[PDB]
Amino acid sequence: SVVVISQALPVPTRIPGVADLVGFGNGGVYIIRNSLLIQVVKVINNFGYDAGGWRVEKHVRLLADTTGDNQSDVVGFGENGVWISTNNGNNTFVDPPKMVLANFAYAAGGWRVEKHIRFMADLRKTGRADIVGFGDGGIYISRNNGGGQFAPAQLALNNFGYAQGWRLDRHLRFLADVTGDGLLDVVGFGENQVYIARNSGNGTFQPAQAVVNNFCIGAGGWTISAHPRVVADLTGDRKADILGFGVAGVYTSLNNGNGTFGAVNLVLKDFGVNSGWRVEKHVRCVSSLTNKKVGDIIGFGDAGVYVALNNGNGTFGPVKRVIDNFGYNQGWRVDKHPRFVVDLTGDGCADIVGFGENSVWACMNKGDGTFGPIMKLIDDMTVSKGWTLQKTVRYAANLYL
Ligand SMILES: CC(=O)N[C@@H]1[C@@H](O)[C@H](O)[C@@H](CO)O[C@H]1O
Ligand SMILES: CC(=O)N[C@@H]1[C@@H](O)[C@H](O)[C@@H](CO)O[C@H]1O
Ligand SMILES: CC(=O)N[C@@H]1[C@@H](O)[C@H](O)[C@@H](CO)O[C@H]1O
Ligand SMILES: CC(=O)N[C@@H]1[C@@H](O)[C@H](O)[C@@H](CO)O[C@H]1O
Ligand SMILES: CC(=O)N[C@@H]1[C@@H](O)[C@H](O)[C@@H](CO)O[C@H]1O
Ligand SMILES: CC(=O)N[C@@H]1[C@@H](O)[C@H](O)[C@@H](CO)O[C@H]1O
Ligand SMILES: [Ca+2]
């Protein structure tokens, strides 16, 4: 499994794909269906700042296939429980949503945005999303048993929890396949080590196992505030490697193939602190922009977008300015204008969309990792129309696969 789930990007998108745009705005849930007709459509009078009292700092809103039909349902970790509005198949969703489990929630379970993490993930290879919470005592799971019926939460592993020292300002946690069986394992960038927890295919993980003594805060000086880190297949074998944007530039540790990891290696003198890159100003990604289907590099910098292509094995060609936009010099701010690298045309090669000041802007990969001219898609889901990071959530996501 190519699927990777991350703090930054808890709603993975498909490659190839024609992703849609989803906004959790004040009055409810809105979608822009990737198609010949580009318009906003309100679909759920809920999951909104004013529509149900939803709060960025108390609740979590995501999209995920909870039924197994490759349609994406709206999922909200609310005040008293978990609320799902399933996809009706026709640009509409069951409304109101159904409370499926009184847990994983602020007033049910004591969940806290600033202490814990909540994802949706197909962890048993059923075609459906199980509920996954990095809680206090460890990782908790609620089995998705089909038909909106979710099993009581059980401990999957007494690690990666708040009790074992995990902290959002110090550490990073991921779901990704590090062994090749297609089952998503825990990759955690802890205090001193980077650990692994192999997925036993049953809502449990085998005990943690350190695999790299680097890429952390007490092991390399990796900070959340300066040195982003991702998990992505860089070699092409559907197993996940490690990649961090450090001081000099990009470092990596390639998967052996069984989920033990190589050695840390400055593979590129750019996208790093020395090369000018700041989390405050700039967004850095890894996604496939070519037919090699491997992690290439994309950074939204000052002048524009910067791309470095992955030869096929972990090594990277020359950095280039693929477009003079989506950058800080064109007014793109991290705290105002979400940007995403995602396939919008269905060719396997990831494109670029940003929710800007007055419009949603797109920019299409030519198919080689070079890019076209910018497109003004629509004048909605923008600052000008009322969308802030403090009161709304926005995703690119595949509603239909
Ligand atoms: C933040 C949150 O959970 N909001 C929910 C809302 O979505 C739901 O419609 C209502 C049902 O009575 O309960 C509220 O608590
Ligand atoms: C933050 C957290 O871990 N919350 C959990 C809750 O989801 C679970 O039902 C319970 C199991 O006893 O323990 C609580 O602490
Ligand atoms: C944040 C962090 O690094 N936590 C780890 C924990 O997950 C592991 O169980 C333990 C044993 O090595 O070491 C702790 O310090
Ligand atoms: C944040 C950062 O860049 N950390 C790196 C560290 O991970 C690595 O082990 C070493 C290699 O020479 O250089 C440090 O400066
Ligand atoms: C923060 C930022 O934008 N950094 C870029 C850098 O990575 C690129 O290599 C260089 C070459 O033109 O231009 C800088 O301005
Ligand atoms: C933050 C933002 O939206 N910046 C855009 C810029 O990307 C675009 O090139 C220009 C065209 O008018 O308009 C600015 O508002
Ligand atoms: Ca594309």
- Domain segments of the chain as ranges: 1-401
Pocket residue to mutate for ligand 4, from 216, 223, 247, 253, most atoms within 8 A of Cβ: 247
Tokens of 48: 């909104």
Ligand with smallest separation from the Cα of 167 = 3
| Position in ligand 1 atom list of the atom nearest CA 80 | 3
Residues 345, 364 contacting (CB under 8 angstroms): yes
Size of the chain, expressed as the number of residues it contains? 401
Q: List the resolution, Å.
A: 2.6
Q: Of the ligands numbered here, which is closest to the C-alpha atom of 102?
A: 2
Q: Is 103 in the pocket of ligand 2 (CB under 6 A)?
A: yes
Longest dimension (CA), the chain: 52
From ligand 2's centre to the CA of 136, what distance in Å?
7
| Secondary structure (3-state) at 329 | helix
- Calculate how far, in angstroms, residue 190's C-alpha sits from the geometric centre of ligand 3: 7
Helix (H) / strand (E) element for 231: namely strand 229-232
Sort strands 154-157 and 229-232 into parallel, antiparallel or unpaired: unpaired
Ligand 5: atom nearest CA of 302 is 3
Q: Which two tokens stand for residue 317?
A: 């060609």
The tokens describing 112, both together, are: 């806290």
> Which residues on adjacent β-strands are paired with residue 347?
none
In angstroms, rounded to a whole number, what is the distance separating the alpha carbons of residues 33 and 249?
37
Closest by CA to 166, choosing from 141, 143, 133, is 133
Identity at 268, one-letter amino acid code = L
The enclosing H or E element of 133 equals: strand 130-134
Q: How was this structure determined?
A: X-ray
For residue 152, give the ligand 2 atom closest to its CA: 9
